[PDB]
Amino acid sequence: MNPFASLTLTTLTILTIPIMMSNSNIYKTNLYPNYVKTTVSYAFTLSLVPLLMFMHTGQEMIISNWHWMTLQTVELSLSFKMDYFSVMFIPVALFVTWSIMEFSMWYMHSDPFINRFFKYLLLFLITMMILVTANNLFQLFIGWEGVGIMSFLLIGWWHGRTDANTAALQAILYNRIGDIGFVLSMAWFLTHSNAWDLQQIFMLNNECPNMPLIGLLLAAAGKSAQFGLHPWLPSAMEGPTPVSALLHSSTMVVAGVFLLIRFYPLMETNKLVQTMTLCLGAITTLFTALCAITQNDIKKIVAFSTSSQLGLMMVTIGINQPHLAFLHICMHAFFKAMLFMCSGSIIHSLNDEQDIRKMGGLYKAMPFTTTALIIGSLALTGMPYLTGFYSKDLIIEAVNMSYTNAWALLMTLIATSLTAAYSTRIIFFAFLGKPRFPPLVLINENNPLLINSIKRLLIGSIFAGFIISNNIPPMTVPNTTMPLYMKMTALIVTIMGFMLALELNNTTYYLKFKYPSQTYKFSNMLGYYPSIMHRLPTYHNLSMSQKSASSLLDLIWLETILPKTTSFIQMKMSIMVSNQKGLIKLYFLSFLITIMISMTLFN
Amino acid sequence: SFPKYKPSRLATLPATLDPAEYDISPETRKAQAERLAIRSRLKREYLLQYNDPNRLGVIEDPALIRWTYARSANIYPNFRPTPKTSLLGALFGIGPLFFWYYVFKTDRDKKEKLIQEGKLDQTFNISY
Amino acid sequence: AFSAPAAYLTHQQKVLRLYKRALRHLESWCVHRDKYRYFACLMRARFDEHKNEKDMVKATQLLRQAEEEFWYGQHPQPYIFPESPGGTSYERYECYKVPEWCLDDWHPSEKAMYPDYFAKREQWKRLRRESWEREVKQLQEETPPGGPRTEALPPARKEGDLPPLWWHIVTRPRERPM
Amino acid sequence: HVTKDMFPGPYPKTPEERAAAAKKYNMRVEDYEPYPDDGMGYGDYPKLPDRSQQERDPWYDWDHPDLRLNWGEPIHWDLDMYIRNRVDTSPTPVSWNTMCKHLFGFVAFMLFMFWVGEIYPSYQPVGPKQYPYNDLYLERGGDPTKEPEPVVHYEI
Amino acid sequence: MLKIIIPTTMLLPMTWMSKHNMIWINATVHSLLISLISLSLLNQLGENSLNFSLTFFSDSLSAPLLVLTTWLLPLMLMASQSHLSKETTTRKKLYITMLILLQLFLIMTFTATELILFYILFEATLVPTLIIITRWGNQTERLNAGLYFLFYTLAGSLPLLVALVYIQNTTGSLNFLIIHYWSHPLSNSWSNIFMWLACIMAFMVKMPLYGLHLWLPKAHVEAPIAGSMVLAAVLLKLGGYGMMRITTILNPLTNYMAYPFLMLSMWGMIMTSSICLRQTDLKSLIAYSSVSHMALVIVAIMIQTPWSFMGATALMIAHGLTSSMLFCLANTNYERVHSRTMILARGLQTLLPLMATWWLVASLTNLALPPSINLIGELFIITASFSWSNITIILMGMNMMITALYSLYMLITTQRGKYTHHINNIKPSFTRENALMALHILPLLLLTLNPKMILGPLY
Ligand SMILES: CCCCCCCCCCCCCCCCCC(=O)OC[C@H](COP(=O)([O-])OCC(O)COP(=O)([O-])OC[C@@H](COC(=O)CCCCCCCCCCCCCCCCC)OC(=O)CCCCCCCCCCCCCCCCC)OC(=O)CCCCCCCCCCCCCCCCC
Ligand SMILES: CCCCCCCCCCCCCCCCC[C@@H](O)O[C@H](CO[C@H](O)CCCCCCCCCCCCCCC)COP(=O)(O)OCC[N+](C)(C)C
Ligand SMILES: CCCCCCCC/C=C/CCCCCCCC(=O)OC[C@H](COP(=O)(O)OCCN)OC(=O)CCCCCCC/C=C/CCCCCCCC
Predict the structure, then answer these.
(1) B9, B42, B67 member nearest D75 (Cβ)
(2) Is some CB atom of chain B closer than 8 A to the CB atom of C167?
(3) How far is residue E110's CA from residue E122's CA, in Å, rounded to a whole number?
(4) Nearest-CA neighbor of A527 among D94, C3, D134, C18?
(5) Helical H runs in A406-473?
């Protein structure tokens, strides 16, 4: 009976079986990672069927299967939404996870706890599937917190390293800052709309007020690492390369953008929140690209690229184009995941070297990673007919052909320029010059796992944009007419960025040296934001937490008021009363005094 | 000449930029010698207690005991009622309470007035 | 890291350390090898000009002034080796470093495996028990009165003697235990 | 195994007790400096410099390599705030004031230009989008029993 | 109700007539059997209550608390079995007798059809706890902690007895059923204001309120592991149960009256969560986290809405289990290290991996990770407060963030990093400790499947 529901629940269910078998004997053998990888691949090829059913018919469904607790009028149930977004995002995420695990079987070959690593990866995948398929706000919050906790665990994978623990706590802190707005949104929706269910919320909110949308925007900014709460995403590179390639690049970090996409019927009916989202996305993409164009760590550069892409996604959201932002999510997953595969291959081949100053000629020394990175950089930049072109070109056209802010449009164009800039920076400083690695050459790629995992995402980043764009139904009005110069704005900006950054990098061979300027220092230290904001508030908090809350009030004044005052008063009274020298003279004089006082007072 | 680096509380002076280190004197050298002598005596005691095979227990650290005792149990007996202590305690223990009371009282008064006149539009509000 | 520190740093130690830091930061600035070689030789030549200077006050004037210049152009993001205290793999494998005495707590069924290892460990334990008893007296007699002045330990001087306080230096887990 | 005299006491006033307290905390008399004698119960605990643990030498063989501390050395009052997992005081290549002003300046400039762009938006040389049936009245909200004002859209 | 009370009474002769080396086995088995017997009470009705007799009744607010109180005793026995090893048989029997008497007093307290009987048992629970704290305590400050714990409670509760006898003199009955059906409004008068204060402050002191929370760190730090467990898990919930029971008579006076308490709790949760960040002690940190959670419960009770009451009940149960688990973990560390300071023993995940997993789960459930019942109560109380006022959320937001911080801080200081080189007496974790943690944690993850079972009478 209508196999859509059975298949779309079976994928998620079979995604959980290795977690059940994690206590079995297979978990103690060396075949566990292959078991998990095969399970993920079968889940992907099984979830491909509901995608085909949607493409044929446009069939949509809600599955509210298990009834959880019901409080008064409100009903809470295990409900799954399998809308276009869910049935479209699930296959892409499963394919990316399959490639990531295939790569990780080789990248984590010498890691003693590799079964636990694979288990951690599968748990994150399950939680993200829960987040994507959620129909009510409570299940979505469950996935929201689960992905954050798995990210905390995976970032601090090497728990003997202080900086990994610091980065994990940073991620938790920023995610809780977003969680504040998430909880505000949940509370407002329950109080005013009387439900956490998606269907009820859309129905009873024809003109959504500011507060729930501001809460949703705060949560999205927290989880997507916008300018206010950006540094945790670059700081999350402390984890293993597969963790950075799966979670912090293509699947987890689009959680905020996906959440804002989920509530697009209420986003389109408000004009202020749209403006805030647009401005936040523009400033985030600009600042992150500006920081990226000057970094030396390849992982940092690519993470800043991811953050800039998230900013571009929220720019797309702010101009009331949620479906196009979803398409951007799907394409960016492919090509940015493959970009991290290439980066991790380079890092592993250079004996855990991440600085680009110690990598020179790799165009010929290692060709397959070379062509994969070239194709990924071309797709990111937006080459016509490439995967990037289908989404990013429409992004540029829609931002240009809309009643938006002039400053936001300018910042988006500059962000595109800087994207081209750091792309050519990566290529030039990792691939073209003379070798700069230590003399003992350990460069090797002849491994089936790495090659197959990279080439699958290569086929994806070549053909997925074309096939998906021509297979999905049309969902928005096109900009079918456009000035010729304004149609070519994206290409001319990209080529200008290429040529200018190439010229600026080509002057490094010159035998002339000068000290850096203030702009370079500002861009290299991340706008000085991670310095001040990670030293001024925390100290000012922690000191207070010891000086005022702990010692001044709790240890001293609260103690002075009730217990110490009582002790002192009772001690003084006892000393005064009991200090009698035993002279009956004084006793009987007091007796006479009280006798006469009683004779004078009580009658 | 080059622009000068200005130290702050959260960004201290660099080790190699202190004017004090370049001013060397026999008294300073003797001070450093006795500092390193104390450090080496403590290190020798710790390693003597550390290496021994017979010992099978945590080595007790008097410095840690002093730190914890001073942080926790030595505060009140050394307290003295002082204008600084009085004003800081009164502020940090009373001001936030009255501030939040004022804020919430004003909010609830506004809400109560709006519900009395009825221009609040509480449709679909059934759970509280 | 292995050697004991000194009570102070001499002028030549300071100039050598400044030379090391400046050359490393110039290598960080000059990505390519030929540019780095040219500028490093230019810097070495500049450095050697004041080599035969005898005035101590002038000597103090030199390098400290250079240090301010070094601080101005110190390449805010210098290159750091992966295992260095600022590297990206500084403490990656500290979580795999398990102490040796933990083996004393293994179940006998676990000690049934690897019997030769535990026999050699027993020989090591016997050697430690004898050597420590010798070392206590040796260090007591060799230490200067009033407490040690420098945290450096003397070597063994007899035939059957072992270096004092050797057990926890020899029995380090490994650099990369797993 | 710690005795009564080994615990912190009241503030030192005389040089003899100052020297005795300096001896208690295993430091020099000249290096010993208690906190200023106010109401807060610092008592007789040394005021070590407010420098963090991150900028301590990472090559010295500490007894606690992760915390960068030695066994018998005195402990800073705010140690748990400086544990390399928290706020640090390591000097930066750029001065604190320059970063603050530069950071503050960048943020302020961005806020002002976004406001200006809100004041001066961008659009196209076009009129508003036109919709067929009374500006989609029946299927945007409904209310068919009101018969709103009809609108005819201009043919050009 | 006697089917639970009589076996608990029979626990005493069984313990005292037990063989010298079979007390722990006999006590644990029969305590678990009594806990199983207590499970029958959970099947509540949507109607009035389970009125067994004139003296005792059951309610879906009383039933989860009774089940938790019964379940806590085997855990306390297993935790106490370790450090009482070098102790004479008579004193171990006395310890078990005190635990049994505490359970009996709590069981009679939670049913308690009449308010004077409730007060008598509510204050009878005080003696066994005081004796346990001041007798089998390690440090020399256990006497001062016992004095604080006794006198805070009695100063709070002495006006309550006068208020109760006055209320019975005026109304004519102290029975809960009669009081609920015959409740009449209290006029806003000075005498009524002082009657409200006398009725409320006794339960406020035991939560405890932020102003009156000083006794709790002393009592928790100085008590043995069983004492800490019973204080954090059950004894703190007595104030919340008393407030929920006695608040019915108080209206409409509660609205004006509630502001001083609402502000104190909303600021004190922030203050105590921030205090947790700078602590050198595990037990003190857990105590302050308990203070923050109970401040939130105070806010929920004072708002006095249905969602508030359900959230308060769920949060009380979840906090009891979580805090008992946290104290058990800290005690397992202390029994090896004998220091009870976080910064000394470090990197315990490398040496004890399963115990580190238990630490992670306990810190996650203290952090209120969904869909755990901790977050269920958290979210219900937060929503009720938002409906009460849209500004409260800001404070709540801070609280949540701060909570997570110190939780993971406690997880990072002791489990992650590098193990202290000198400590070598860290033996592998015993089966008893792992069983203790499993028996602490499994009920939470079972209850999250059936939240309505702990949501109180207003479900
Ligand atoms: C309407 C007509 C449309 C056509 C328009 C015109 C077409 C193009 C014309 C070209 C225009 C300029 C393009 C060249 C950019 C400059 C590149 C350069 O020379 O850098 C070297 C040079 C210094 O290099 P260095 O210190 O020696 O570094 C040593 C080695 O090179 C170390 O090198 P390394 O190996 O470590 O790494 C190399 C890296 C390191 O290089 C860097 O340091 C990068 C830093 C500067 C480049 C960033 C430019 C992006 C500008 C956006 C700024 C947004 C507003 C920010 C507000 C700040 C408020 C304070 O360089 C790169 O990778 C490439 C840099 C990025 C260039 C590629 C894309 C830029 C072209 C797009 C710009 C706009 C066109 C949009 C297109 C759409 C059409 C509308 O940079 C500069 O001199 C800065 C020039 C411009 C900076 C503007 C900010 C000045 C702010 C001063 C205060 C203003 C008052 C504020 C008051 C506020 C109070 C409330
Ligand atoms: C220390 C840690 C915390 C401990 C617990 C603290 C919580 C208990 C505090 C009690 C809260 C307030 C008590 C009385 C509130 C009544 C409302 C009053 O504040 O408002 C005005 C009252 O005005 C003035 O407040 C009059 C009273 C002034 C004298 C009270 C002392 C003020 C500060 C003392 C605080 C010390 C508390 C602790 C004692 C040990 C309203 O004016 P009015 O319409 O006319 O009176 C209405 C009441 N009627 C109808 C019964 C007549
Ligand atoms: C910190 C707790 C909060 C304390 C707030 C106030 C503290 C200052 C008060 C100090 C004690 C004052 C003692 C005298 C109070 C007199 C109140 C009174 O008599 O009202 C009784 C009232 C009406 O009297 P009638 O004459 O019978 O009525 C006929 C005419 N209408 O009847 C009652 O309600 C009796 C209830 C007893 C009142 C309680 C008295 C004690 C104060 C209330 C408790 C607050 C302090 C709690 C201590 C906290 C420590 C944890």
Answers:
(1) B67
(2) yes
(3) 9
(4) D94
(5) 406-427, 448-471
